[model samples]
Target: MGAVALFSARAVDIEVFTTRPDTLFGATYLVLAPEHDLVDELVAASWPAGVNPLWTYGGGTPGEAIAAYRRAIAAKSDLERQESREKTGVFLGSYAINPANGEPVPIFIADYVLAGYGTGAIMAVPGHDQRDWDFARAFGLPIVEVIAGGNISESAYTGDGILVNSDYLNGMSVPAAKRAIVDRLESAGRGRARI
Candidate 1:
């Protein structure tokens, strides 16, 4: 629950400072706070990926869903954001490319993702993080194993392991792999040294 710039390549597009860049490829979705600054732009008609009409927001459009979700969870404390109700969200029906692999990571509007988190958005890495893992399971999104040290079937493994599904970081130790991925981000101007 610390404010670390998790996503370096993107902020509005993505945001946050994370120590786990090696898990980038496993990011299959994004859960943005209903009030994120970029949420407006995200749901705008001009969005690159069309909005999911079937995915209603506040029983209306994406904007309405945002307002409704915000009204419902806006009163919760900061801690609750991290430990809020079983993660719930409405798919924006839109996606963003994972900088590590250019894969479209879907975006969702969820109350669990407080607008006050390091970033109002979360890179849904269902493999290594428990919260994300549970969210994926509930929503039926794909779960992937990025690091090989733990079993992803039961719970998320926050331990170090040789990278498997990861592209460039594959075969490297966790520490070494994180350094390498950050280096790639910086070398490509998609990232900086730190916040």
Candidate 2:
């Protein structure tokens, strides 16, 4: 799996998105849900006094963790999940390091992202994916466009095109970029292409 750095005003979030196993090197950010398993660990490590230890778990028993997470997602009104203005996350106080940059990224549980896809975490690639773009926009993240070509407009483009702004893969076409990135990651013993 690939990792990305997620950041908030006071903390960072790390999430894992599974769609582009080959483009992982390009992952710029990570996001996690508030109810992620590691929230308490994060809180204790980052800010002991910032969060109430008891409340950090949202008043649930240990065995109810799974059921609680399911209920949080399922009980949401459609508007809460779909409307960006209504976005909210429970802080997990956890941090993940970006595989590419080795930077500490924060973890948050947001209603905007779903857990069923990939690993419930996502590596934000604002340049190429619309969902990532929306989140980045919502959070005021620095957007970087890696894919380049006339066919690709300012909007998110998932097609094969030349890579731009990506350091080592710059100017290379999409297929070439994928091969070079995957090979480089494998050589470093970081990952492998999946499906």
Candidate 3:
């Protein structure tokens, strides 16, 4: 259930330690900051017809309505940004391929993502982050249950119980699963490890 034991054959299950638990559950979607360098690349290439109904109702998709929301977030003070009620975003009409599950998770551009942040990107974790939950709910995205420990059907259950929803990591405790995930990320050069 931990990482340090990994790298060897100690049942290295990729419950998918998404830095946020990707290998653990795989990201339902990704959110990129408005000015992310990759946004242009995505718009020019990754997106298909560029029509995403997931987030936008009639406003517009990605690049089109992006500026308006970006300006709104820019207007918020630090505290306002933190406790924001207006979490606006648009489907970039793109997807970041989940390396662990091989599913194409859609990408969105939003104001909730502050400028000058970690590559201006956030993998959606609807269960863990209330912001992500809000975004997911607003966009009609799927909310998945990874651990059986808590009442995740409604909100995230913080209790440490057996992991669920997939392969070896399923039924594993929260701590162990975290370690295994960390270990895997180390070998790959990443994970949520503070070190």
Estimate TM-scores for all models.
Answer: 0.80, 0.63, 0.72
- Expressed as tens digits, the lDDT of each residue in 127-185 for candidate 1 is 99888898888777889999999999989888988998887788999878777878887
lDDT scores in order: 0.71, 0.54, 0.58
- For model 1, the stretches where C-alpha displacement exceeds 4 angstroms are 1-12, 44-58, 74-85, 193-195
TM-score, candidate 1, is 0.80
Per-residue error (Å), model 2, residue 171:
2.0
**Better TM-score candidate (1, 2):** 1
- Over the stretch 1-195, how does candidate 3's per-residue lDDT look in tens digits? 111111111111112212444224635777777777666556422235645455653445455555565665578687876676657777756556544455667767777775484445666767656677778877778777676655545775545566676465766777777766666656766444642
Say which prediction, candidate 2 or candidate 3, comes out ahead on lDDT: 3
Per-candidate clashes, comma-separated: 12, 22, 15
Candidate 1 C-alpha error for residue 122, in Å: 2.4
Tell me the tens digit of each residue's lDDT in model 2 across 70-155.
Answer: 56767878666666654434434455565554555444456566656655666667667776666565555546667775332356
Query: Residue 148 in candidate 3 has what lDDT?
Result: 69
The worst-scoring run of ten residues by lDDT in candidate 2 lies at 1-10
